[PDB]
Amino acid sequence: MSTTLAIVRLDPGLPLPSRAHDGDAGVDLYSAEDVELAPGRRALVRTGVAVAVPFGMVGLVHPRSGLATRVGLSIVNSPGTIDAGYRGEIKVALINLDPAAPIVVHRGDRIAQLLVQRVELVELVEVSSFDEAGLA
Amino acid sequence: STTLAIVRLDPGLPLPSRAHDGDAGVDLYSAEDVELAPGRRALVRTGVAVAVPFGMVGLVHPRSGLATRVGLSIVNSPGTIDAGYRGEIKVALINLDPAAPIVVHRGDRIAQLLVQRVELVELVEVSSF
Amino acid sequence: STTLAIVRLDPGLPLPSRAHDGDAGVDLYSAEDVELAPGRRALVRTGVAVAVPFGMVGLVHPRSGLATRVGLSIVNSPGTIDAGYRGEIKVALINLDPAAPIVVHRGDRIAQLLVQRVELVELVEVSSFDE
Numbered sequence: 519m520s521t522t523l524a525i526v527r528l529d530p531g532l533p534l535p536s537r538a539h540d541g542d543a544g545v546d547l548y549s550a551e552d553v554e555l556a557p558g559r560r561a562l563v564r565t566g567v568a569v570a571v572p573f574g575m576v577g578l579v580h581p582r583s584g585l586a587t588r589v590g591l592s593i594v595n596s597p598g599t600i601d602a603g604y605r606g607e608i609k610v611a612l613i614n615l616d617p618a619a620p621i622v623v624h625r626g627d628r629i630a631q632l633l634v635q636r637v638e639l640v641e642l643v644e645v646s647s648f649d650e651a652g653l654a
Numbered sequence: 655s656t657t658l659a660i661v662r663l664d665p666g667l668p669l670p671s672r673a674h675d676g677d678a679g680v681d682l683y684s685a686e687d688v689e690l691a692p693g694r695r696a697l698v699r700t701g702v703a704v705a706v707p708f709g710m711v712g713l714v715h716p717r718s719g720l721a722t723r724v725g726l727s728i729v730n731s732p733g734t735i736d737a738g739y740r741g742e743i744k745v746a747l748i749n750l751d752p753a754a755p756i757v758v759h760r761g762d763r764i765a766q767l768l769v770q771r772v773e774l775v776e777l778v779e780v781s782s783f
Numbered sequence: 784s785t786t787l788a789i790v791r792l793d794p795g796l797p798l799p800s801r802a803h804d805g806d807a808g809v810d811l812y813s814a815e816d817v818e819l820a821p822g823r824r825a826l827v828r829t830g831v832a833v834a835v836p837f838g839m840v841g842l843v844h845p846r847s848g849l850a851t852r853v854g855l856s857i858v859n860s861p862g863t864i865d866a867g868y869r870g871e872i873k874v875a876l877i878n879l880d881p882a883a884p885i886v887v888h889r890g891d892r893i894a895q896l897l898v899q900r901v902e903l904v905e906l907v908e909v910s911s912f913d914e
């Protein structure tokens with residue numbers, strides 16, 4: 519039993535991200551733009567949404583496993599980390615890892631998936647050494 | 655104390671195991687021999703299928719030794735295994751080295767599998783932040 | 784509300800810190816000056832070691848700004864830091880740009896460290912799944 523995730527469609531022309539099956543970890547995010555990535559090239563692509571990740575959680579942006587195999591699409595900073603206080607637009611750093619074939623992304627194509635998990639907001643405690651702290 | 659049910663689709667590989675008690679992952683083996691030229695990728699079978707419980711997610715992470723040593727990565731890292739998936743775990747291996755091919759043989763440890771809780775949030779559209 | 788024991792192996796770097804209260808990671812610093820030629824990688828010392836609690840995992844993620852602006856990535860992203868690991872955290876940086884080098888300085892923020900719970904699942908072999 520979870521909470522909600524407040525989401526804004528900055529681009530009202532794209533579908534609302536949704537969970538394709540009940541247990542699926544992620545919701546698909548769409549591209550708000552048309553872009554062509556030549557081999558080895560990247561772009562920062564707008565998804566047309568902003569979210570409010572709850573305090574104590576994190577949003578995580580993962581690549582889609584299909585396009586990964588089929589054409590080599592990946593995310594430079596995978597997993598992209600969406601902090602709880604971030605209210606800006608989610609943008610995805612796509613990259614074409616194929617050596618030869620460009621990748622054409624159309625507005626409205628699914629380009630990544632977004633997960634939400636709890637994160638432990640640890641307090642760091644400096645210790646002189648693991649030995650002196652009893653942590654061998 | 656959670657159990658992960660697992661099928662050895664390939665009975666000739668060892669069962670994945672957790673090498674030390676608190677290690678986050680269990681290592682997955684390759685069921686095949688593959689050779690990756692610089693910059694090339696392959697979808698490699700592990701020989702196993704799993705049953706990620708509802709409320710959880712399976713995560714396929716690259717191994718650090720091979721990453722540094724030969725440039726071995728995973729295109730879709732972290733590879734996401736949904737609770738509903740009962741097919742074979744396949745690893746989208748890639749050679750990020752510019753010049754040296756990567757050899758993988760059957761039986762090699764090619765990735766690690768983590769299981770975590772996931773928050774199955776209900777998206778609610780709102781006007782603005 | 785967890786704590787994380789950390790050692791500064793390199794005493795001349797700032798202790799990692801959490802920039803804003805709910806931010807998922809603490810940024811890790813390079814202990815070294817390296818130039819990464821296009822497509823090339825390097826194992827970069829961060830100057831710290833940690834004791835990830837039992838039942839948890841430390842995760843090393845790339846920084847998003849550097850990822851776009853220059854193509855800096857991490858080959859084993861997300862880097863997996865096991866609870867029993869007491870060595871130095873090292874980051875496997877890789878310049879995924881086709882043409883421009885990346886200069887990394889000592890003191891630059893080069894990755895972030897998240898700590899999450901992990902399910903230390905007991906693998907149990909079955910003949911088949913229930914259909």
Ligand SMILES: O=c1ccn([C@H]2C[C@H](O)[C@@H](COP(=O)(O)O)O2)c(=O)[nH]1
Pocket residue numbers: 581582583584585714730732733734735736737739742743744745746
């Ligand atoms: O490293 C991986 C990642 C995913 N999958 C399988 C399991 C997922 O539930 C399904 C994902 O398909 P997508 O909807 O992301 O394309 O594929 C794998 O075998 N290995």
Ligand SMILES: O=c1ccn([C@H]2C[C@H](O)[C@@H](COP(=O)(O)O)O2)c(=O)[nH]1
Pocket residue numbers: 579595597598599600601604607608609610611845846847848
């Ligand atoms: O895939 C990503 C990753 C991050 N960010 C946004 C949200 C983060 O909370 C913020 C700052 O990123 P960093 O400087 O921490 O890496 O950028 C994205 O839009 N997409």
Ligand SMILES: O=c1ccn([C@H]2C[C@H](O)[C@@H](COP(=O)(O)O)O2)c(=O)[nH]1
Pocket residue numbers: 716717718719766843859861862863864865868871872873874875
């Ligand atoms: O980014 C990383 C990833 C791993 N390690 C260390 C810690 C791990 O516990 C150990 C084992 O590596 P793996 O094969 O589990 O990834 O290497 C690092 O210093 N940095």
Ligand SMILES: [Mg+2]
Pocket residue numbers: 538542631
């Ligand atoms: Mg999916």
Ligand SMILES: [Mg+2]
Pocket residue numbers: 673677
């Ligand atoms: Mg290990």
Ligand SMILES: [Mg+2]
Pocket residue numbers: 802806895
């Ligand atoms: Mg940050």
